[PDB]
Design a protein around this ligand. Sequence first.
Ligand SMILES: O=c1ccn([C@@H]2O[C@H](COP(=O)(O)OP(=O)(O)O[C@H]3O[C@H](CO)[C@@H](O)[C@H](O)[C@H]3O)[C@@H](O)[C@H]2O)c(=O)[nH]1
Length: 440
Amino acid sequence: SLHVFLVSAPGQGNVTPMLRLAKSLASKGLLVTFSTPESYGKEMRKTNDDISDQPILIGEGSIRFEFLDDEWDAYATHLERVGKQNLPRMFKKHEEEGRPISCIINNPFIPWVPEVAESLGIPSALLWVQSCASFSSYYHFFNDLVSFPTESNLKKDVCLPSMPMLKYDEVPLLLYPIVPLPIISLKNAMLRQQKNLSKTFCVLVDTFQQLEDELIHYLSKLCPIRPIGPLFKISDCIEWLDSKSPSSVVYISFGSIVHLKQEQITEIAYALMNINISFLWVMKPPQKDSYDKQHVLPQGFLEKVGEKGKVVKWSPQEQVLSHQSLACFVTHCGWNSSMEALANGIRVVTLPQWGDQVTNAKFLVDVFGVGVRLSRGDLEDRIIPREEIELRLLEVTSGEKATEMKHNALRWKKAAEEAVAKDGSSSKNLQEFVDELNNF
Ligand SMILES: O=c1ccn([C@@H]2O[C@H](COP(=O)(O)OP(=O)(O)O[C@H]3O[C@H](CO)[C@@H](O)[C@H](O)[C@H]3O)[C@@H](O)[C@H]2O)c(=O)[nH]1
């Protein structure tokens, strides 16, 4: 019935939640138009045959794919410029066909979208694609409410409300003073998103109330949040895994962006060879425009390790992480992977790299209690050697608190599944958002 337009920044980290939310809304019986820049839509339309220029009927609703014309930080202003003109182009064609948009939902890395929305008098909504503690970090940074590291004091602790104390290198690294050249682009977009929050009536977050309970209430009277996660639940690999014994495979994957250093890759392989543990390891091939090059393994690696180890280029990570044969998840602690691990009951080994990964790894290890810390990310600037890698793999699988960390994980999978059930907090939140879309 209701035409709700969704628009994502390019990239797995942003498209996966927007699309997951799109499927949620369509299931709730709405016309949902997902939109992403064409240069990126090109790459998911080649790999997908059901991204097929018809609505995919979901529940009582449907999902049409109207990619914004990319005409393609130099890119950031280009996407803004092109987009601020071509977006209303799409809201005229749509309106003048009897189906006009009643809400635009964007993610932070296109923070100008709310402006365009309010320019046309369309209500603007924000899908936050990180944790509520990541939101709270940015909100308090932008509004200058709590003290943060400065060039004058690069190592300052930070005390945010209803959060553990974070060390200088546990707050999302986009807020760190020492920021490389391109990293400034995303920094401003996050801060630009904090600015336009005034122009937004609802902030949706892929978290569940039990996971970040006290922070969500604190923000409910400051900058209210709507937890509607885990979105992925609300909305050769397997057979090989089907042939292992339960709780025995080390699964390793660092998402679609992180490309570790060769030296770091080598210490992981020797680590896995040494302790002779079963593993599934995603080693992402690079972009064919070099930039950074394909990794290599030790010689005879695959043949020394044998049936115990398996290297793939990409993985059905949702299917993998629900698999009883997994023992742990060496993760870069992206939020989409952190939520997948939490809602599947998987213990983690944290190797965060940049952005909010350091925060999420702080929480998984010290707050959520579901894993072991392996590294501290980019400000640490240290090749984690094979011996501590072997060390954390034994702590998380057979150490003293291994079963305790397992129990913790199970209870978070229990609590994640309550929230997504028909009457749970997140299902209710999501319906009350649908309840508010209609009423206005
Ligand atoms: O082999 C793989 C590896 C990953 N995934 C999927 O890829 C996504 C990974 O997302 P995430 O865990 O969020 O990793 P990144 O792509 O690095 O996410 C980026 O965007 C997120 C939202 O801004 C931030 O939390 C991260 O810091 C940023 O790196 C998840 O849906 C995984 O299931 C696969 O299907 N197969």
